[PDB]
Amino acid sequence: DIQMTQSPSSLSASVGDRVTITCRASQSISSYLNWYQQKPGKAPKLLIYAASSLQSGVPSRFSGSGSGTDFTLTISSLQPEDFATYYCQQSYTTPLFTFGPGTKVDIKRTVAAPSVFIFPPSDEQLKSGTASVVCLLNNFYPREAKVQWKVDNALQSGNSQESVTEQDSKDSTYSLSSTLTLSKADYEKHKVYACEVTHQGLSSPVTKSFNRGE
Amino acid sequence: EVQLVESGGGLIQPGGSLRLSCAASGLIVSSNYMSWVRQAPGKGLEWVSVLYAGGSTDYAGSVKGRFTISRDNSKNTLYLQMNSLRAEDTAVYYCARDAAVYGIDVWGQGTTVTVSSASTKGPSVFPLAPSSGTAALGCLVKDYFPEPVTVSWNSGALTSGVHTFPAVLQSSGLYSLSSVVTVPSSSLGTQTYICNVNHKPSNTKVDKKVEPKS
Amino acid sequence: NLCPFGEVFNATRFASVYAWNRKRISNCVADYSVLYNSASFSTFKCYGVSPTKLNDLCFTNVYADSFVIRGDEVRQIAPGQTGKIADYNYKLPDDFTGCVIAWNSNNLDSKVGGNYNYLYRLFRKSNLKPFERDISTEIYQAGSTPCNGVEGFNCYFPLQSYGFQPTYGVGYQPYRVVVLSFELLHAPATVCG
């Protein structure tokens, strides 16, 4: 079986840039390799077939190249409509095709550190028996950020979920929230709830926190 | 034009059945490799089953035995019978024409299949209270099913700095999102902030006032 | 005289699967254990017969088909198989009687740069019948508007190349296949042991 891989998982570019996505097949597939574009909420769009042929109706700033294990997709001058996610697909073993994992191209922007806020659980929610603690990371770039819950300094593992916005229409930044979900019984046997965030735009990690009941 | 029109998705309980339909216009199903491909939330493209022009079938290992692809040449329509559905069959389902070395050039529009044992349920709306330049506040919209829920702030008079996050699916099978906004600290005493939640599947409408805590 | 199995198994060229070669064996004697006591074949399945008993039997005619396919694809040279080779290039009947002999030909049929001599039909409107041989090279009409010998949308060239180097995976390398068919008719049997 042939496994496909994609160079950088995500890359940033400005309009008018020259962008290069790579793709690698886990075994030589000659030139049976196609490239696809996908924007959120819509179906994929064929860009390149047979490694380097341009699909009908696709702008000529798109082009492919490669044979064997390694392939490249180039966009000569990135247009604003090209910010999207790009997948490769091999057709050596047609019709049992495997897809690459994707490359997201977002909008480059200067680096911006997140504003971090920690939100205790409301006392409404504490009646129902659950406690939700929320960590907000607001208006940061680039998308790579890591959140770490500590409870009374013990790092938490399997009890948090995260969500991130699309890149802002006018900031070009991201915002992220992380939610720690505890039982009320468990919530109340501990004192210090803390949010440790690390991001490229911060000197050293930032920590917001609160003491339960203060 | 050439178009693959899909239909038949929806909610279904685990163990249920569902029949997807793909009506072709501009190509002959009987003459093509017709594939079903699905894409789970936040994942990539996965091949499901295929219908050779000659009549052979093949299926993904994970659906082998529960799904059966077929067609009706009179109606020029591709089908997929989905029996014994599990939670992980939840994905957007695409029909597509596989032209092999020439690429998967014709894609359907998507039809969404949610397999769940959750009861439909209106959300709880808890306040993410501001604490002690700029303050952040918000609403936790917890435990609603199915999707989706819409949020706004002071009935649409408040749109600057608003972030409504994508919903997450909790281990309980209910969804949950938060919506935050950044406003000037100085307005906390004076300005009223109310979030307006709407969940049409359960005919639930909530407004919740977010104050500083005492 | 005995049977020219050496001029089919050891022949310099082999055919593409879509245009598979066939040889009609007649009025000779054939030692088959010399084939199964060669130890040089990766595949040697016999159907409706046992290879050892084979030198004891007589047939009116024996047919040797031969062609190249890919490794994962020898699975399809069996009764009751589906896939682009067995559907669209070479089909065995459900009641086949004979032997499917395959071996690794990566040493001879896969050169650097590409061995684009070996082809296979990739597009066909319907499944082959057993022992059918499709050689047409028409443009394939995937739509309702005819192609008129021009490649383009809905208009595909039906054969595609393998591209075999001597540097590959496992079942993506070239295999030479020989299918022996045993026919017994109400006619003087001419191939014996």
Transcribe chain A into DSSP letters: ---EEES-SEEEE-TT--EEEEEEESS--TT-EEEEEE-TTS--EEEEETTTEEPTT--TTEEEEEETTEEEEEESS--GGG-SEEEEEE-TTTTS-EE---EEEEE----BPPEEEEEPPPHHHHHHTEEEEEEEEEEEBSS-EEEEEEETTEEP-SSEEEEEPPPPTTT--EEEEEEEEEEHHHHTT--EEEEEEEETTSSS-EEEEEETT-
Domains of chain B: 3-115 (2.60.40.10), 124-210 (2.60.40.10)
- Pick B28's closest partner by Cβ from C82, C144, C156: C144
CB atoms within 10 A of CB B110: 17
Tokens 């999207």 belong to residue = A84
Task: State the Cα–Cα distance between residues B129 and B179, nearest whole angstrom.
Answer: 12
Which residues in chain A have Cβ-Cβ distances shorter than 8 Å to B104? 34, 36, 44, 46, 89, 97
Contact indicator for C171, C5 with CB cutoff of 8 Å: no
Which residues in chain B have Cβ-Cβ distances shorter than 8 Å to A128? 124
**C154: closest CA among A53, B102, B53, A36?**
B102
Relative to beta strand C191-192, strand C28-29 is parallel
Report the neighbours of B using a cutoff of 3 or more CB pairs below 8 angstroms: A, C
**C181: closest CA among C18, C19, C20?**
C20
Task: State the Cα–Cα distance between residues C186 and A110, nearest whole angstrom.
Answer: 87
Tell me if chain C has a CB within 8 Å of the CB of B45: no
- Complete edge-to-edge strand list for the sheet that includes strand A206-211: A154-155, A145-151, A192-199, A206-211
Which residues in chain C have Cβ-Cβ distances shorter than 8 Å to A58? none
Size of interface B-C (CB pairs under 8 A): 48
Nearest-neighbour CA in chain A from C47: distance (Å):
28
CB atoms within 10 A of CB B183: 19
- Pick B54's closest partner by Cβ from C87, C140, C142: C87
Nearest-neighbour CA in chain A from B151: distance (Å):
14
Structure token digits, residue C185: 């008719």
Relative to beta strand A33-38, strand A45-49 is antiparallel
Task: State the Cα–Cα distance between residues A9 and A22, nearest whole angstrom.
Answer: 10
- Pick A177's closest partner by Cβ from B104, B126, B165: B165
Reported residue count of chain B is: 214
- Pick A91's closest partner by Cβ from B94, B101, B129: B101
CB contact under 8 A, C125 and B55: no
CB contact under 8 A, A87 and B45: yes
Domain boundaries, chain A: 4-107, 115-211
- Pick B53's closest partner by Cβ from C83, C125, C154: C125
Tell me if chain C has a CB within 8 Å of the CB of A119: no
CB contact under 8 A, C156 and B53: no
Number of continuous H segments (helices) and E segments (strands) in chain C: 4, 11
Structure token digits, residue C18: 């879509």
Beta bridge partners of A146: A198
Q: Which A residues 72-131 touch B at CB under 8 Å?
A: 87, 89, 91, 94-102, 115, 117, 119-122, 124-125, 128
**B150: closest CA among B199, B194, B203?**
B199
Nearest-neighbour CA in chain A from C63: distance (Å):
31
Mutate to test the interface with B, among A36, A86, A117, A178 (most CBs of B within 10 A): A117
The amino acid that residue B153 corresponds to is: W
**B107: closest CA among B99, B97, B122?**
B97
Tell me if chain B has a CB within 8 Å of the CB of C161: no
Structure token digits, residue A203: 């000197």
Indicate the class that CATH gives domain C6-120+161-192: alpha beta
The amino acid that residue C148 corresponds to is: N
| Segment (H or E) for C7 | helix C6-9
Indicate the class that CATH gives domain A115-211: mainly beta
**B114: closest CA among B142, B148, B79?**
B148
Task: State the Cα–Cα distance between residues A162 and B176, nearest whole angstrom.
Answer: 11
Contact indicator for C98, C85 with CB cutoff of 8 Å: no
CB contact under 8 A, C142 and B52: no
Relative to beta strand A115-119, strand A130-140 is antiparallel
Indicate the class that CATH gives domain A4-107: mainly beta
Domain A4-107 identical in fold to domain A115-211 = yes
* Resolution value, angstrom units: 2.7
